[PDB]
RNA sequence: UUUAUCAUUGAACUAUAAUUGUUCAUUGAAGUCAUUGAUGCAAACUCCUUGGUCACACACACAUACGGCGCGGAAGGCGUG
RNA sequence: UCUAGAAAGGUAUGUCUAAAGU
């Protein structure tokens, strides 16, 4: 007998369906059918029985839609079906996970990137993603994952280096757990600078002659001047430092020392 | 060969009554020890006996529904006996080499100076230094610790993992004469 | 024959069951990562400057920047630009190295936290984190470590720590911020904390 | 460009060779390094293609203007059988003259290192 | 026999991510397990591109070596040592 | 100044009495001397620092202590004292009225 | 010459995709130094239709050799 | 400008088809994403990389059309030792 | 019938033995 027909006729089957059909809201249940459904099939591949296969997706589907803020699941359910063979249902698994969510999750757009990364294979429909979570999910506490995935693919993929500027400025004024990194992301870029046609990458050319009293087209000795600008530049990266610095210490301080949980465990817990 | 085709001519030549001296019977049982232990380093040559693959889909065919020939079984128990028998006068080789290191002279007399340096209190101090005297043993072995290997004959060791003996045990040599064995106690009991 | 081009030793008749077991010899390991850490080395370092291409300056710009002013240039002695040379390639690298990885540490109870987060039961990679474990076919490299393992298994549900708050929980870690403007901070903070 | 009338492929190492191949595709890349198959291994080679779309305006009857779909791939190696034709492209980014120098100086580094190495290993 | 530079090149790059087109027009890409000496590759952990764009995935694949119309190694095998024009061998055994 | 010297190599039968003894009311009145034990074991380490008031007190215990025998072995008496982008912050504290308690709730 | 590295897949289900057009899924046993394949219960994976009980494939129509089981 | 799966049936239904066409549903195969896409056409703006930014001169030449009569450098052609 | 002397290395591997203080 194969690997249906025997899981079928195994005793613990009817036991863990019926705790499952008879209390459908406890959690450690349908978790502990799962399991026992995914054990069942020891190796897990293209050939195993389609019987059994689309018996675990109406598992994976039915707990998800009773349990629709599990996020670990959806990221699970989702790499099941990319290892079965087809991508096309993997999009579809991470897109019902963001809008059950209602867009805002952080960790689908973090590992729905990820995967995103290797499938899409389109450099334009891949940075209309990006710039999806981004004005979804960017402003998050916690985000820094998501903006440094996100200046990975930049610096990978393009051949500009105006994009990369462009999406580290904004990065510089948003109050994010861990904004030193880009901080100093920007410093080192900046102290790795060569000559002064190259300071029009930060602002304007008239931004930094009015405001910073600097030319570009200044044409002479260029070494006093450069250096000059590089510490002009790197003042103004410390004020705006400060102002960073102290929304995310204020914010850390007073409200996000004390949360301990982000995730959405069982509706059988109770919070603090 | 250099062409693929002169290779795969090759095979399908070698492919392409059934008694007498012409045809390794051993070969056509199973398993040649000449043709086991072709590359290795206890390497006998060449096998003696041409061998051929039509004959042997002969055999599998007449052993599959035919019949049996049991002169065959007694040729080929003939050749695998004297072959076993010789590697375990090897092996006893082996094990009088040891013996033989540990029945070093110098060495004896060197444990039997610290053995007569073995010589309640009195036997507290009595095993202190029959414990330097077992660990002056266990230098000695820590010059050498080998094993045997009991079906090769090859020497092992303990302090190695499972894993370096996994390494040992997955060879040509140990296969082919661990099958050599299987054979030998397989027609040893069917005789008997 | 063969001949290990990043080995710079010799080798008998080129089989397949000896070539591949040098290729994956832990000598040969050695000295190609050293081969190739030191070419993306020199990859980096190397500054090729663009070449000067000087033009005659005009008059009237002659003009202009003969009645700007002189700025003055600071530089360094030897050993002061020896020191900053050598903690600016140590700040590279811990850029280079470094990553944020607190989506990891945040999510540490959650109900399927072992099917996504483990990195050797995800079912994309799964296979490959237990492949490619390696033989260490020595005892002593078994032998060296004695902590424990803590090979968190697929198989685990939610029951399991209940409340996440009684088994104790660790704060996360403060922001990290920069040591060259750590003078800039706020002195004060505005609420009492105890410990 | 004019390359030398007798310059086989074994002399353009570190030119900008254009190969075209079996179906119309180009790979404008740095040749590096060939065989006897005549399998090349172009450096930042650019698979290039004319569409089935375009492909009315090279028709036989102001010039025409042809788009074609420049898609980079990084060291290529190329399959032999594919390869139906090199034209050279673009001279290296060094001169003859230099390349002599750089050539003088590997070979003094070679003698150099083996002469250390055998030095080494006889102490 | 001898093999030569693009050859000896694709077995430099056992272990890294490679990307293959094939002759009937599909692309394969993932991590290159073993070549062989007639270009015959395998490739673990693939994301195979059907010739009309259908994406799928599949977990190990043997290509015939005869059928691979280019093969994509990574960059820093530029620096590669079989690229070195001027070697230096010390003494055969 | 808190000048602090390290000396070490030290007899396992030697205390921190001892070792006051030997660097308190010679050249000096040394403020503290801590040998450091086994934290489990209470064994000491072989080696332990000392805390001087002023510096020319320890550098005169450091020229003459340098070598000399204590409990059969030479106490090696080197100075004990005297680069990451990211640190964590560090606040002073509001020194706690009525305001500045988080926990006020009148 | 020089055997395919096929000694992982022995004895295990394989779809492989014969000519460009067709496609044949069996059970592998054997392969020799062309890739020419004998597989054991072949099925042309297309309502699908079967082979018949053994099938021996010249290698020359052989484009890639997918392999369906664990391996 | 142009595209966005078919079937079995029900209710009606033009109708040679595997009820195709038409609205609504069930069930069934497999099902790259994209429709702010794809294909065609044209313009504007911005940003990179490359070199003798050399020397002499601010000048009245030419039917055999034009002193190719400065120092170099890059690439090719041809001849000699 | 025309005089048979098989190699001697290479790489991979573990273990022993050992050399170091402040
Ligand atoms: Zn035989
Ligand atoms: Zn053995
Ligand atoms: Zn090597």
Redesign the interface.
Known sequence: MDKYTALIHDENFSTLTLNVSRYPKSLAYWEKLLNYIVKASAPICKSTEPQLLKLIRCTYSSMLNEFPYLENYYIDFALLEYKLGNVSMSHKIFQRGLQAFNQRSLLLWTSYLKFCNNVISHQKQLFKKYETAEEYVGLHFFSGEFWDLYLEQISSRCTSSKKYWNVLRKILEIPLHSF??FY?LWLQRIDDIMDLKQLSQLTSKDELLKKLKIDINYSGRKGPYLQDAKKKLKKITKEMYMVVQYQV?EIYSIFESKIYINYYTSPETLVS | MSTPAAEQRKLVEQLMGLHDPKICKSYLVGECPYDLFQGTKQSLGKCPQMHLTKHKIQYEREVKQGKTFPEFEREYLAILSRFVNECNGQISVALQNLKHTAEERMKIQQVTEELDVLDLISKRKEVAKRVRNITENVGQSAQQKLQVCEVCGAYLSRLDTDRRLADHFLGKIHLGYVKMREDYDRLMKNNR | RYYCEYCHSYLTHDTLSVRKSHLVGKNHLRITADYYRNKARDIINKHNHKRRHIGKRGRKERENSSQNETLKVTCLSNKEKRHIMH?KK??QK??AQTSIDTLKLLYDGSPGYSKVFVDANRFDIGDLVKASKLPQRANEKSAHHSFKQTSRSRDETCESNPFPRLNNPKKL????????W?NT?????????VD | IQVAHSSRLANLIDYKLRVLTQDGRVYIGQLMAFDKHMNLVLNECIEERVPKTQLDKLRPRTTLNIKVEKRVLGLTILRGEQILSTVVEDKPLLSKKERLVRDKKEKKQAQKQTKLRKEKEKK | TMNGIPVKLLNEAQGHIVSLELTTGATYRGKLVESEDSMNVQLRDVIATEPQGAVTHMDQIFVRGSQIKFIVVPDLLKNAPLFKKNSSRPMPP | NNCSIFVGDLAPNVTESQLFELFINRYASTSHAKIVHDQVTGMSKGYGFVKFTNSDEQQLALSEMQGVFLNGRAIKVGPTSG???????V??????NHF???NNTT | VSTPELKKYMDKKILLNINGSRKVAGILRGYDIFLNVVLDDAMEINNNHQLGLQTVIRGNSIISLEALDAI
């Open positions: 030193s990194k100093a210490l | 903690v140590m700040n811990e850029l870690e403060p922001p990290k911020i920069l040591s060259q750590s901070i706020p002195k004060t903070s505005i609420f009492y904390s | 680069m990451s982008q990211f640190i964590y912050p606040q002073q504290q509001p020194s706690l500045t308690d988080p």
